[PDB]
Design a protein around this ligand. Structure first.
Ligand SMILES: CC(=O)SCCNC(=O)CCNC(=O)[C@H](O)C(C)(C)COP(=O)(O)OP(=O)(O)OC[C@H]1O[C@@H](n2cnc3c(N)ncnc32)[C@H](O)[C@@H]1OP(=O)(O)O
Ligand SMILES: Nc1ncnc2c1ncn2[C@@H]1O[C@H](COP(=O)(O)O)[C@@H](O)[C@H]1O
Length: 180
């Protein structure tokens, strides 16, 4: 499979999902910083990304988790730029289940980049038999994340009451799945 390269997973001519490396710390930090105000509305970690050292630490932890297959953290490259992150935030090997997360900088939204990335990951891990069940959980009022889950052919399984906390407030999540 020529799409599986040493540097990452080639989605299409414009998108590669890069394995994390320290060389990406600066670009990743700057991207988060540019998007911090908007990102804080939907995620709980951007509020605390205050220096490049925070991105370095994130990369270091991501590399450890990737090595040990606790997670699969990938940096989305669109054309020449890091565009965001797509991940299996949790890999449950015993139950062949992966829980998916994602974000894109504002300048990278509206281009199908995450939908294309997720479809590629599900092909690679799902059609190979590594993962049987893919899961997306997202806050009920997160319009774009819900739309992405549906665009990727996931099915709504239910609502998880008060399951995600942002800034001390618990929000309901939709839970979606795609089963191979
Ligand atoms: C499970 C979780 O991680 S929950 C937390 C999710 N993350 C966040 O909330 C962080 C903040 N938000 C974001 O980063 C973004 O809004 C995201 C990642 C959730 C969604 O980004 P999008 O760019 O909408 O992702 P996606 O890859 O699905 O693209 C769909 C959009 O691209 C358009 N599009 C353009 N080209 C294509 C294409 N080739 N294929 C598919 N869609 C395309 C679609 O029409 C749609 O645009 P619209 O919203 O105007 O209808
Ligand atoms: N400190 C961080 N820097 C960059 N991306 C992150 C960080 N923490 C989480 N993410 C990613 O954010 C996405 C959404 O996760 P969550 O915030 O849990 O909804 C996932 O792709 C995570 O890997």
């Amino acid at each position: 499979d020529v799409s599986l390269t040493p540097s990452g997973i080639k989605v299409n001519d414009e998108i590669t999902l890069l394995y994390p490396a320290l060389k990406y710390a600066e670009e990743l930090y700057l991207l988060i910083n540019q998007n911090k105000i908007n990102f804080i509305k939907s995620m709980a970690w951007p509020a605390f990304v205050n220096n490049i050292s925070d991105s370095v630490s994130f990369i270091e932890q991501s590399m450890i988790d990737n090595q040990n297959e606790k997670a699969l953290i990938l940096f989305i490259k669109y054309k020449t730029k890091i565009a965001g992150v797509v991940s299996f935030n949790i890999i449950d090997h015993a139950n062949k289940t992966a829980y998916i997360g994602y974000w894109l900088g504002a300048n990278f939204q509206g281009k199908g980049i995450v939908t294309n990335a997720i479809n590629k990951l599900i092909q690679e891990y799902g059609d190979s038999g590594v993962i049987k069940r893919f899961v997306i959980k997202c806050i009920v009022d997160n319009k774009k994340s819900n739309a992405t889950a549906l665009r990727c052919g996931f099915t709504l399984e239910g609502v998880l009451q008060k399951a995600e906390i942002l800034n001390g407030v618990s929000y309901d999540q939709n839970i979606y799945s795609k089963v191979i």
